[PDB]
């Protein structure tokens, strides 16, 4: 047992004293001089083992690491410093592991409102490795979040920041984390869904994910990207402007193409998106009639999968209930 918590708690005190003296209105503490980055590197690597996590949680090691991340971001901001990014990366990684599978640690971290503002701020960072880790923290916090957690996650503007961040991400590891969090947050409330669509170029990007050539022979990004689209497609149905963006990016053809997929989540997201999209719009209804959607949906009603069986039948319901004039 090494109490690097005490070192970090002591380091944060020095930074807080400095912040009190140097308010919004001389020499600043540097974490290289106290060996903070090697100290947090250890605490990051200890958080993988759940026995050490049990020790960390009683002592208050989540707080201390969240205090460190926060104060460093507050002081130095969006820097490209080797030491300052790595410090935050490991801090976030330890926070990813402390938040994992832990109802209490999710609730506390979210209630630490200053740290959450710092977290969201770091998505505009030029380091995509940090973006990936910050997304990973936000992903876990958005997973099975209590009322207060969900409220604060919205409060801080984490959806808009994640979606904006997602548009400029160039790595697939990063984009996987970013979309996972957005998938979670999309299921929280209707205002989150509204915010995802409110961002410019956002819906267009999400149609792109459906036909995304992955490297590394994996489907996770198409699963999560379409999974987001499915959640928000509820509010897309009542909005004509957004439907037009799906039309012009060949969304519906791809959705019907995804019904023939070997992945089971892809097919599920497709059926749920078509469920929402097949209601209330004559032209998209007629479009799907024309594309052979009715014969495609009839295959999938006898599947041993609650949400493929429901999704296909609920969508097929809407199509048959609003049959076009041509088909008579």
């Amino acid at each position: 047992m090494l109490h690097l918590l005490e070192q970090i708690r002591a380091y944060c005190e020095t930074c807080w004293e400095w912040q009190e003296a140097h308010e919004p209105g001389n020499p600043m503490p540097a974490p290289v001089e106290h060996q903070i980055c090697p100290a947090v590197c250890v605490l990051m690597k200890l958080s993988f083992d759940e026995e050490h996590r049990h020790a960390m949680n009683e002592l208050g090691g989540l707080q201390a690491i969240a205090e460190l991340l926060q104060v460093d971001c507050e002081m130095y901001g969006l820097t490209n410093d080797h030491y300052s990014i790595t410090l935050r990366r490991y801090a976030g990684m330890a926070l990813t592991n402390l938040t994992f599978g832990d109802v209490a640690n999710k609730a506390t971290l979210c209630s630490m409102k200053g740290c959450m503002r710092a977290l969201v701020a770091q998505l505009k960072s030029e380091s995509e490795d940090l973006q990936q880790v910050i997304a990973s923290v936000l992903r876990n916090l958005s997973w099975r979040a209590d009322v207060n957690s969900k409220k604060t996650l919205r409060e801080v503007g984490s959806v808009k920041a994640l979606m904006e961040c997602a548009l400029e991400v160039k790595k697939e590891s990063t984009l996987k984390s970013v979309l996972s969090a957005l998938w979670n947050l999309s299921a929280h409330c209707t205002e989150n869904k509204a915010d995802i669509c409110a961002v410019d170029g956002a819906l267009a990007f999400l149609v792109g994910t459906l036909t995304y050539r992955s490297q590394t022979n994996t489907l996770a990004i198409i699963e999560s990207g379409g999974g987001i689209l499915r959640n928000v497609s509820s509010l897309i149905a009542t909005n004509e402007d957004h439907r037009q963006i799906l039309r012009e990016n060949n969304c519906l053809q791809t959705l019907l193409q995804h019904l023939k997929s070997h992945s089971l989540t892809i097919v599920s997201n497709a059926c749920g998106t078509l469920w929402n999209l097949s209601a209330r719009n004559p032209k998209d209804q007629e479009a799907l009639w024309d594309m052979g959607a009715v014969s495609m949906l009839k295959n999938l009603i006898h599947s041993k999968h609650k949400m493929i069986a429901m999704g296909s039948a609920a969508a097929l319901r809407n199509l048959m209930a609003n049959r076009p004039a041509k088909y008579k």
Partner: peptide, 7 residues
């Protein structure tokens, strides 16, 4: 999206 430990 689910959840996970750090990579």
């Amino acid at each position: 999206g689910g959840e996970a430990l750090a990579d």
